[PDB]
Design a protein around this ligand. Structure first.
Ligand code: CLA
Ligand code: CLA
Ligand code: CLA
Ligand code: CLA
Ligand code: CLA
Ligand code: CLA
Ligand code: CLA
Ligand SMILES: CCCCCCCCCCCCCCCC(=O)OC[C@H](COP(=O)(O)OC[C@@H](O)CO)OC(=O)CCCCCCCCCCCCCCC
Ligand SMILES: CCCCCCCCCCCCCCCC(=O)OC[C@H](COP(=O)(O)OC[C@@H](O)CO)OC(=O)CCCCCCCCCCCCCCC
Ligand SMILES: CC1=C(/C=C/C(C)=C\C=C\C(C)=C\C=C\C=C(C)\C=C\C=C(C)\C=C\C2=C(C)C(=O)CCC2(C)C)C(C)(C)CCC1
Ligand SMILES: CC1=C(/C=C/C(C)=C\C=C/C(C)=C\C=C\C=C(C)\C=C\C=C(C)\C=C\C2=C(C)CCCC2(C)C)C(C)(C)CCC1
Lengths: 143, 73, 38, 140, 80, 40, 69, 744
């Protein structure tokens, strides 16, 4: 009801309106400032006029952090999984090191393209595969 | 004792200066906080401590210093 | 340099003593002790 | 006894012996040369070794050993008969290198074994087990 | 001076003696490796501590170890 | 030849190619849809 | 008892390959304290500063090896 | 292609192929076996151009060096053509040429995106872009460029030349590879570099100035406007168009061959001063100077004997120079400078860096290009740029001197020559240089400390100032006086002073001052002694690194350790940074320090006692109101009235076309702080951290086959010093540019 009493919506904040009347054009679009002033009037602003972001977790602000978080998690899992499987397939090529320096382009592309299913292959390797390794089979230093 | 009369305006002084390198400008600059001689102003809040503790005269601080000499002994 | 506080003659000679006599004496004693026996 | 050999042909330098050679100790390298040759001085600059015997005084033992390695690794007829001694201000001479007339690189009978641990590296005693003593894991 | 210890994991490749710049080490007969020899440190009073013997050692972690101790004119490498 | 492809497949060439490709992707995305601070 | 080709794990604690896997190359005859020659795929630390790789072989004893295949 | 010459090449030594491009590390046998540790990668870049560590053949090394020279010349041609094309199709050179005094030289337009379009500030005439400080427009006006199409044509010619140099490198490393005999023709190479490269170059440039620069500029200064000037070649097609400007042209080149040179006094002048219209050197004076320099260099290019008996044998000259103090003298130096590439590189780097610093000092006070003295940003930028180039080249000269000492020094061929005796009293040399540096440091910085303490205590009369205890630089004042009295006496035909910095008229163009007498006082004395001190410390570090590369009392076998090694263990008390490379590493920091104080002195003195505006009264109001005398004598003065004050432009640069300067300011600060991590730590901690992270990757089987290794000690040092220099120099770059662009 009265949550975040220190902040007000950017449309209801006069400083934000005054500043958005003079927002600067970003690209070649002369309305880039106008469209930015129209898009940022949605969020909550502070007394100065700049929008504050809310990561509290509520789905009213699901775009402030939740959606970029999901997108980056997907893409970074893709990168990590394709790189890991590329390194593991490299492990069995007699000369793995010089293929780690000189990138096998076809194998790398085949690993990369088949990366859209990383979150499923991950649990596939976790359930009974090679994702996690036993501690006693890992080289360590003296204690 | 002067600081207790007006704590919000009088700045507390740690101790006096005695430096032969000083010139007239430095002497005039460091004769501050209503002191007749060059002095450094305190910045450790020990004045507020001693006042809130109940010490109101110089003789109390003096006897405390002497007693602490005895404690170190 | 002066002092409206009592015994203002004490820093007069006490500042050179803490700054010249005491350091020279302590440094000389410690120097002799560092280079003792041989 | 008395060290013999001609000093190398050298014009002098500021890197040679200092007050230590007469107050503390000095070292000497002797070597025989098949011809008048040019070698590098461990103290900087070039010198000329005479054909026959050469005696040279140096300030530190590592300098004589550097000269020895240069004699044995940088010349067509390798000079390996070099000897290194330590001279004291009382004129005393202590033969040093090679210790038993044979270079230490290759095994030779008659040599005792010192600093040899019967155990492994990782088998040293824990320091807590030898604390408040004047010893370290590698000493007991 | 510095301590130079040798352990039973010695293979007798004589590299640490060849690497020593102050003739601290020797190759003495032994019966614990193929080369039938082991390293020794008879002239430790001339050790400076340059760790070259350790650098030239092949065993998985060195069989010869140098521990820096009481410094002197010889250990500090002073020509004065 | 084969060596030319092997040179074109080295680590710096591939990494700079991917970085330039991703740079183009992001630059064009922010060119046509700019000032995307948050998702509506 | 170990032969050539025996994949084994090193138990020397202080070893660089303690917990890693190495293949046996040869076993020297009796008398030697560490006869089992084990070659490795991951080079160790040996070499002067800035050098390329390291050493990929070392001699151990039977007691310091755990047998795999 | 013999032509009865000394040319000798190999018709096909190296086949052309692409397979080796797929084997990174082909030049190093230790790297050809493939990577096993990450260090393999780094060393691949470290030894890339280290041709000596790749092959022991001096001939193959000379061939690699020659083709690499050709490649670098192609790169510099590409860069020069890029600059010309950006002036052609991306600059306001014509709008500027039409009215310089009211427009800012702009180039490099920024694509409006993500807000960066704000960097295209209005420079005048409606043009929007980034103001450039390289001074290209002034140089092009001096050359006589009128049309952007000509800048385009110069760019095309430069790209053609780049292709030519690249083809020449390929042709002389794969087709006709010259022999080692051909490179060792130092007498011929010297004759040609003096006569052919330098002599002919200045001769042709004097010709271009007489036919293009001088006539066009003579009209340009008189207000004829660019579009009304005939093309440069219309002056060659019409001799009357040259005779109307210079009646001396009407007599033709007949007075030249008959030594009737005075007739040419119309266009070959000795005015000495500056052009009152534009504030640059007289192009007649520069053409006369290029003519004299050309004749001098051509005459010099005949000294050395080649294929005709006449000439000087440099070996005989070097060996003939020996005295009672120096033994056999310069004997063996011919063999050194003929069989060693690093000795040549050290000498040439030293002299070239010195020449670059001299270029900076001679261009700041004698503005040669039109309207370059008016622009304070361009002046400061060119000054500090050439300063830093010279400093780096000098540090490299020290590096290669040490490299020669370790690699190419032969004691068997240096028996009692100059180098031998230097090695034999290096202790005396270095101890006395140590003392000199200490005496200067006490007697320069210590004077500043005295002034700080005296002013802080309220004792201004006890300071080293013009108003208290004066340190008048009497000698420099006397020499300035002699310079201001030279025209008419010790310079009879010279019309004016060589430069007004020594004194004379306060030449001002437009509303600003171009060059006025630069007075010298107590603060100038103190700053010059700071300069001497820092230069001496840097030279001490580098010279000690060179002389002690082979051996020392600590390490008598240092040469066997090499030029680039971290140390020789913690023994002997500790022997870190004993190598010559580490001496270069430290000399880098001290060169940075020296040059930073030099350029700060330049900026503050120019802004304080030189740069400024002039009101129609003769009176001059300087940029920062002459605060150099009373403020540049304490360190607090440099902190407050120079750093704190003049960085206000850089910090408040946000929201304007200079926000990039604030960004790069913060970026240089960050890179300095980042360098500190590589400079203060050690490799072992990082290797242990990498071990833990490698275990973590082993937990998920992401362990790379190329084992991650911490940076080597030498590499850690190189990275630290590189980031330190980068951060500091970029910081002062942003600061200087923003400041000198926000002072009008
Ligand atoms: C650690 C406590 C301490 C400190 C930091 C100071 C600080 C100072 N005093 Mg003071 N003083 C102290 C205690 C202290 N005092 C005590 C307890 C007395 C009464 C006996 C005095 C009486 C005294 C006089 C009469 C004067 C000063 C003066 C000064 C100034 C110059 C020092 C000097 O010349 O006198 C030297 C100090 C003494 C002779 C007294 C001995 C100090 C105590 C008893 C011992 C401190 C030991 C302590 C462990 C420090 C050891 C060093 C440490 C590394 C272990 C200086 C700012 C002068 C001044 O007024 O400046 C303008 C001066 O005139 N002091
Ligand atoms: C990295 C991949 C990439 C992608 C997918 C796009 C995407 C697109 N570009 Mg583009 N372009 C790229 C790289 C890329 N660009 C780069 C690196 C440059 C600099 C040389 C350009 C220069 C460029 C031009 C000149 C043009 C485009 C144009 C276009 C659009 C057609 C399209 C959406 C066109 C456009 O949008 O018109 C304005 C078009 O004219 N781009
Ligand atoms: C000498 C080195 C050099 C440097 C540092 C630059 C720098 C720059 N140039 Mg330039 N240029 C150069 C040489 C150079 N140029 C040469 C030799 C030519 C003649 C062929 C040109 C012709 C040229 C054109 C036609 C353009 C640039 C442009 C640019 C800018 C963007 C480049 C870009 O993103 O393209 C694309 C990047 C990738 C494909 C990756 C950039 C700051 C652009 C510009 O200034 O925009 C207004 C542009 O349009 N340059
Ligand atoms: C008049 C003859 C002549 C000329 C002008 C040059 C000029 C040059 N030499 Mg060369 N040289 C000569 C004779 C000559 N040399 C002889 C006889 C020998 C045998 C002893 C050598 C052996 C030699 C070696 C081993 C090397 C050079 C190098 C260089 C270049 C380094 C300087 C530089 O970068 O400046 C500025 C650069 C330029 C101005 C670029 C222009 C380069 C063009 C292609 C040359 C001049 C044009 C040509 C003379 C045609 C002019 C016709 C027309 C314009 C009138 C330079 C361009 C060094 C090098 O390669 O550096 C890259 C090098 O390694 N010289
Ligand atoms: C490499 C430099 C260079 C070049 C190629 C030229 C080229 C030329 N000059 Mg020039 N000249 C030069 C240097 C040069 N000069 C110098 C240094 C001087 C000063 C002494 C002169 C002074 C000079 C005069 C006085 C004249 C020429 C003239 C000419 C033109 C016809 C002369 C014949 O040929 C010709 C295109 C003649 C001309 O046609 O005027 C444009 C003419 O009368 N020159
Ligand atoms: C004509 C000048 C010249 C010549 C040809 C050489 C030639 C050579 N030098 Mg020398 N040197 C020079 C100038 C020169 N140098 C200067 C100016 C310095 C002072 C810094 C030095 C200091 C020096 C040292 C300390 C060393 C050499 C070494 C070498 C040899 C190895 C080359 C190499 O390192 O590979 C290639 C070079 C690199 C991989 C370095 C790349 C690092 C870049 C440039 C970082 C700089 C940043 C960049 C400028 C701007 C930032 C961009 C960034 C944000 C992307 C080589 C034969 C090495 C040697 O051992 O000699 C045998 C060596 O240790 N030189
Ligand atoms: C502000 C920082 C700083 C300062 C103070 C110094 C100081 C010095 N450096 Mg150094 N250096 C620095 C940074 C600094 N360095 C950094 C970051 C590096 C890493 C690259 C180096 C690396 C370096 C090298 C490689 C070398 C030096 C050298 C020197 C010495 C030069 C000789 C000299 O000037 O005479 C003396 C000057 C001073 C001592 C300045 C202070 C003088 C004050 C004002 C007087 C003090 C009054 C009185 C004594 C105080 C008494 C106190 C009281 C309680 C008793 C000098 C002592 C060179 C050298 O050794 O010279 C031969 C040298 O080779 N430096
Ligand atoms: C403001 C400008 C900043 C100037 C800072 C200059 C820093 C000077 C530091 C001194 C060392 C320089 C000599 C290096 C040569 C050198 O020997 O350095 C020292 C170091 C050598 O280490 P080691 O002694 O272990 O090498 C021995 C090996 O050869 C073993 O065989 O090499 C490295 O730093 C490796 C890192 C390479 C980094 C690879 C990155 C490649 C960059 C690609 C782009 C290049 C730039 C293009 C031009 C724009
Ligand atoms: C306050 C007023 C007093 C001013 C007097 C100042 C001058 C007195 C000290 C000057 C040193 C004289 C020695 C050089 C005169 C000279 O070179 O003599 C010549 C002599 C070598 O000559 P040779 O007879 O061997 O000539 C044969 C050659 O062709 C072969 O090399 O050099 C030496 O004796 C080595 C000693 C040099 C070491 C001294 C250098 C010290 C640096 C001095 C820096 C002060 C001024 C720097 C300004 C840039
Ligand atoms: C017979 C007896 C009792 C009666 C006791 C009576 C009759 C009095 C008791 C007095 C007591 C217990 C006094 C405790 C005094 C402690 C004092 C006074 C100070 C300690 C100060 C210290 C340690 C340091 C102080 C410092 C100094 C000096 C300063 O000046 C600045 C502050 C600070 C730096 C802290 C009762 C019936 C109750 C129980 C039955 C036995
Ligand atoms: C949402 C939210 C949030 C947060 C929360 C949290 C706290 C979370 C967490 C979490 C956690 C606590 C986690 C942990 C974990 C563990 C693990 C263990 C994981 C990982 C793993 C793995 C195994 C991986 C793998 C992979 C993949 C899959 C891909 C790529 C490659 C790789 C290999 C990397 C916030 C507040 C911010 C906002 C609002 C709400």
């Amino acid at each position: 009801a009265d949550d975040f009493a220190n902040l007000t919506p950017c449309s209801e904040n006069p400083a934000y309106l005054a500043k958005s009347k003079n927002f600067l054009n970003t690209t070649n679009d002369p309305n880039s400032g106008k469209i930015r002033a129209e898009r940022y009037a949605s969020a909550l602003c502070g007394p100065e006029g700049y929008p504050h972001l809310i990561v509290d977790g509520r789905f009213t602000h699901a775009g402030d952090f939740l959606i970029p978080s999901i997108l980056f998690l997907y893409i970074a899992g893709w990168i990590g999984w394709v790189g890991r499987s590329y390194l593991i397939e490299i492990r069995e090529s007699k000369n793995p090191e010089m293929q780690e320096v000189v990138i096998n382009v076809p194998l790398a592309i085949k690993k990369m393209l088949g990366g859209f299913l990383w979150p499923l292959a991950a649990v596939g390797e976790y359930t009974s595969g090679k994702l996690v390794m036993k501690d006693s089979e890992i080289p360590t230093s003296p204690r | 004792e002067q600081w207790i009369k007006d704590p919000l305006n009088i700045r507390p002084i740690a101790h006096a200066i005695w430096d032969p390198h000083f010139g007239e400008g430095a002497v005039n600059a460091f004769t501050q906080a209503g002191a007749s001689n060059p002095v450094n102003i305190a910045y450790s809040g020990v004045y507020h401590w001693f006042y809130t503790i109940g010490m109101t005269t110089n003789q109390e601080l003096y006897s405390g210093a002497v007693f602490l000499l005895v404690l170190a002994s | 340099m002066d002092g409206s506080y009592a015994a203002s003659y004490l820093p007069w000679i006490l500042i050179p003593m803490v700054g010249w006599l005491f350091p020279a004496v302590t440094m000389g004693l410690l120097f002799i002790h560092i280079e003792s026996e041989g | 006894t008395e060290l013999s050999g001609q000093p190398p042909k050298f014009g002098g330098s500021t890197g040679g012996l200092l007050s230590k050679a007469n107050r503390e100790e000095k070292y000497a390298i002797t070597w025989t040369s098949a011809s008048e040759q040019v070698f590098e001085m461990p103290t900087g600059g070039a010198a000329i070794m005479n054909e026959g015997e050469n005696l040279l005084y140096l300030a530190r033992k590592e300098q004589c050993l550097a000269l020895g390695t240069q004699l044995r690794t940088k010349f067509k007829p390798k000079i390996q008969d070099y000897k290194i001694y330590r001279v004291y201000p009382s004129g005393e001479v202590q033969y040093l290198h090679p210790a038993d007339g044979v270079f230490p690189e290759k095994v030779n009978e008659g040599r005792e074994a010192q600093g040899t641990k019967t155990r492994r590296i990782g088998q040293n005693p824990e320091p807590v087990t030898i604390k408040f003593s004047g010893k370290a894991p590698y000493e007991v | 001076s510095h301590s130079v210890k040798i352990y039973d994991t010695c293979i007798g490749c004589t590299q640490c003696v060849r690497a020593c710049p102050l003739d601290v080490l020797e190759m003495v007969p032994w019966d614990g490796c193929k080369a039938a020899q082991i390293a020794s440190s008879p002239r430790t009073e001339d050790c400076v501590g340059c760790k070259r013997c350790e650098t030239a050692c092949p065993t998985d972690f060195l069989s010869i170890r140098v521990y820096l101790g009481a410094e002197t004119t010889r250990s500090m490498g002073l020509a004065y | 030849m084969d060596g030319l492809k092997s040179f074109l497949s080295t680590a710096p060439v591939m990494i700079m190619a991917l970085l330039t490709f991703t740079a183009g992707i992001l630059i064009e995305f922010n060119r046509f849809y700019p000032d995307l601070l948050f998702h509506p | 008892a170990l032969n050539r080709g025996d994949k084994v794990r090193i138990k020397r604690t202080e070893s660089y390959w303690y917990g890693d896997v190495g293949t046996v190359a040869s076993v020297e005859k009796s008398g030697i304290l560490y006869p089992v020659i084990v070659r490795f795929d991951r080079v160790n630390y040996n070499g002067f500063s800035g050098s390329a790789s390291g050493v990929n072989t070392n001699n151990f004893a039977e007691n310091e090896l755990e047998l795999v295949q | 292609r013999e032509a009865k010459a000394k040319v000798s090449v190999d018709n096909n030594p190296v086949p052309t192929s692409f397979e080796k491009w797929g084997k990174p590390g082909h030049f190093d046998r230790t790297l050809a076996r493939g990577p096993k540790t990450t260090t393999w990668i780094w060393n691949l870049h470290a030894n890339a151009h280290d041709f000596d560590s790749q092959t022991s053949d001096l001939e193959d090394v000379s061939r690699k060096i020659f083709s690499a020279h050709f490649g670098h010349l192609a790169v510099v041609f590409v860069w020069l053509s890029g600059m010309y094309f950006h002036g052609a199709k991306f600059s306001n050179y014509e709008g500027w040429l039409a009215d310089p005094t009211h427009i800012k030289p702009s180039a490099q337009v920024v694509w409006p995106i993500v807000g960066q379009g704000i960097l295209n500030g209005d420079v005048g005439g409606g043009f929007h872009g980034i103001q450039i400080t390289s001074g290209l427009f002034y140089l092009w006006r001096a050359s006589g460029f009128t049309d952007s199409y000509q800048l385009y044509c110069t760019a095309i010619g430069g790209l053609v030349m780049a292709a030519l140099m690249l083809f020449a490198g390929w042709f002389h490393y794969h087709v006709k590879a010259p022999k080692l005999e051909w490179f060792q023709n130092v007498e011929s190479m010297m004759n040609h570099h003096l006569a052919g490269l330098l002599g002919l170059g200045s001769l042709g440039w004097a010709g271009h100035q007489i036919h293009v620069s001088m006539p066009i500029n003579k009209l340009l200064d008189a207000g004829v406007a660019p579009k009304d000037i005939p093309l440069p070649h219309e002056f060659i097609l019409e001799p009357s168009k040259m005779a109307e400007l210079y009646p001396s042209f009407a007599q033709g080149l007949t007075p030249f061959f008959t030594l009737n040179w005075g007739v040419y006094s119309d266009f070959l002048t000795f005015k000495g001063g500056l052009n009152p219209v534009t504030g640059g050197l007289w192009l007649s004076d520069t053409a006369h100077h290029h003519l004299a320099i050309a004749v001098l260099f051509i005459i010099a290019g005949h000294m050395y004997r080649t294929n005709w008996g006449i000439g000087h044998s440099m070996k005989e000259i070097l060996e003939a120079h020996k005295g009672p103090f120096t033994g056999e003298g310069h004997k063996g130096l011919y063999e050194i400078l003929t069989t060693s590439w690093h000795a040549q590189l050290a000498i040439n780097l030293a002299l070239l860096g010195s020449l670059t610093i001299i270029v900076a000092q001679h261009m700041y006070a004698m503005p040669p290009y039109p309207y370059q003295a008016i622009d304070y940003a361009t002046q400061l930028s060119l000054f500090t740029h050439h300063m830093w180039i010279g400093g780096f080249l000098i540090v490299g000269a020290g590096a290669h001197g040490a490299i020669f000492m370790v690699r190419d020094y032969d004691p068997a061929k240096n028996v009692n020559n100059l180098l031998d005796r230097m090695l034999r009293h290096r202790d005396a040399i270095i101890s006395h240089l140590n003392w000199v540096c200490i005496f200067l440091g006490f007697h320069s910085f210590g004077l500043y400390i005295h002034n700080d303490t005296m002013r802080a205590l309220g004792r201004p009369q006890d300071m080293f100032s013009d108003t208290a205890i004066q340190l008048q630089p009497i000698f420099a004042q006397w020499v300035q006086h002699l310079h201001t009295l030279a025209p008419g006496a010790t310079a009879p035909n010279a019309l004016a002073t060589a430069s007004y910095a020594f004194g004379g008229e306060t030449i001002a163009v437009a509303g600003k001052v171009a060059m006025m007498p630069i007075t010298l006082g107590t603060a100038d004395f103190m700053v010059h002694h700071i300069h001497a001190f820092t230069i001496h410390v840097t030279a001490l570090i580098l010279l000690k690194g060179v002389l002690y590369a082979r051996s020392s009392r600590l390490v008598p076998d240092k040469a066997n350790l090499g030029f680039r090694f971290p140390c020789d263990g913690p023994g002997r008390g500790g022997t870190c940074q004993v190598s010559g490379w580490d001496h270069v590493f430290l000399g880098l920091f001290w060169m940075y320090n020296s040059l930073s104080i030099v350029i700060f002195h330049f900026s503050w003195k120019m802004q304080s006692d030189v740069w400024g505006t002039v009101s129609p009264d003769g009176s001059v109001t300087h940029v920062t109101l002459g605060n150099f005398a009373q403020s540049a004598i304490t360190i607090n003065g440099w902190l407050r009235d120079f750093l704190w004050a003049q960085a206000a432009n850089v910090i408040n640069s946000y929201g304007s076309a200079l926000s990039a300067y604030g960004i790069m300011f913060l970026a240089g600060h960050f890179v300095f702080a980042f360098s500190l991590m590589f400079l203060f730590s050690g490799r072992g901690y990082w290797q242990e951290l990498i071990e833990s992270i490698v275990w973590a990757h082993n937990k998920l089987n992401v362990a790379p086959a190329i084992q991650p290794r911490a940076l080597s000690i030498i590499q850690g040092r190189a990275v630290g010093v590189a980031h330190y220099l980068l951060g500091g120099i970029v910081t002062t770059w942003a600061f200087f540019l923003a400041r000198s662009l926000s002072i009008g």
